[PDB]
Amino acid sequence: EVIGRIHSFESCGTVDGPGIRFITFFQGCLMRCLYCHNRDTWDTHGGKEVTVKDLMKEVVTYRHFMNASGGGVTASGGEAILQAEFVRDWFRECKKEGIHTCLDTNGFVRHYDPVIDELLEVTDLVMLDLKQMNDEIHKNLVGVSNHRTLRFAQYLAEKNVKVWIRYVVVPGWSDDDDSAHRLGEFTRDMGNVEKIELLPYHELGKHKWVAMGEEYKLDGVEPPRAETMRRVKGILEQYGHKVMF
Ligand SMILES: C[S@@+](CC[C@H](N)C(=O)[O-])C[C@H]1O[C@@H](n2cnc3c(N)ncnc32)[C@H](O)[C@@H]1O
Ligand code: SF4
Numbered sequence: 001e002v003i004g005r006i007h008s009f010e011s012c013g014t015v016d017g018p019g020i021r022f023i024t025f026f027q028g029c030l031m032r033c034l035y036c037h038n039r040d041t042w043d044t045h046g047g048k049e050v051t052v053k054d055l056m057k058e059v060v061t062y063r064h065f066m067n068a069s070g071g072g073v074t075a076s077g078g079e080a081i082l083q084a085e086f087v088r089d090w091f092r093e094c095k096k097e098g099i100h101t102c103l104d105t106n107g108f109v110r111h112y113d114p115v116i117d118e119l120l121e122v123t124d125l126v127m128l129d130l131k132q133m134n135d136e137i138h139k140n141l142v143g144v145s146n147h148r149t150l151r152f153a154q155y156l157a158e159k160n161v162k163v164w165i166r167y168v169v170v171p172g173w174s175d176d177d178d179s180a181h182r183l184g185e186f187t188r189d190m191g192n193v194e195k196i197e198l199l200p201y202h203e204l205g206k207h208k209w210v211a212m213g214e215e216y217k218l219d220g221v222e223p224p225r226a227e228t229m230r231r232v233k234g235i236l237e238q239y240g241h242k243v244m245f
């Protein structure tokens with residue numbers, strides 16, 4: 001049995017529609033986003049050990065609120081794809097229960113072993129972050145190059161996996177016109193992308209950096225103005241996808 005390492009899990013209403021999402025926050029991430037609102041999910045050796053059986057006992061207590069009309073499970077974190085074998089196993093069991101599955105990922109896939117395709121076969125929706133198309137900025141914002149994530153986005157397109165692209169809009173970092181055009185260009189031909197969703201930067205989770213004795217590097221940065229969200233949305237819309245925030 002594969003052992004999973006989790007930060008926590010929670011049931012919460014879906015953003016829209018009926019039903020609930022049971023979200024497991026996986027422990028461990030290898031990106032370093034300056035904005036991360038879950039800074040305590042980074043350590044790969046932390047969290048709580050769980051089995052798929054353990055986690056399904058929690059999931060099924062919400063069965064009546066997860067249906068085709070809305071609701072399901074989400075693998076988030078942290079970075080769930082670092083535990084691809086466990087998430088594959090979990091989603092396989094969710095499918096046996098008829099539950100919709102969603103992978104919330106940074107796409108930082110460094111090895112293409114068989115487990116990736118197996119996980120995707122039992123994933124109904126991938127919410128992929130594309131954090132910055134400009135790799136010079138991406139390296140300063142996230143600590144790593146965007147190359148692997150971009151290749152994974154192309155892989156998902158090749159496999160026709162249903163995808164929502166998520167773009168966190170941070171003043172001074174990801175609110176500029178050029179970066180928005182680059183994102184529009186890159187995703188234009190990906191017919192598997194149902195929508196691009198802009199997430200406005202928020203300062204929530206600062207306290208988690210302070211607990212760890214680490215400075216929060218976006219002190220003083222405010223959320224983007226509505227005008228900025230509308231401008232980025234308009235730029236992206238020129239490339240043909242549905243765009244929302
Ligand atoms: C905590 S991440 C976990 C999943 C995966 N590691 C990722 O980054 O996509 C879930 C979502 O929250 C976003 N997010 C993280 N910190 C944020 C912040 N300060 N403001 C707005 N969105 C943020 C991420 O970019 C991502 O879309
Ligand atoms: S990739 Fe996701 S969990 Fe990891 S540091 Fe960035 S926002 Fe946080």
Ligand SMILES: [Cl-]
Nearest residue numbers: 029030079108
């Ligand atoms: Cl990672």
Ligand SMILES: [K+]
Nearest residue numbers: 035036037204
């Ligand atoms: K934060």
Ligand SMILES: [K+]
Nearest residue numbers: 104105127129
């Ligand atoms: K994501």
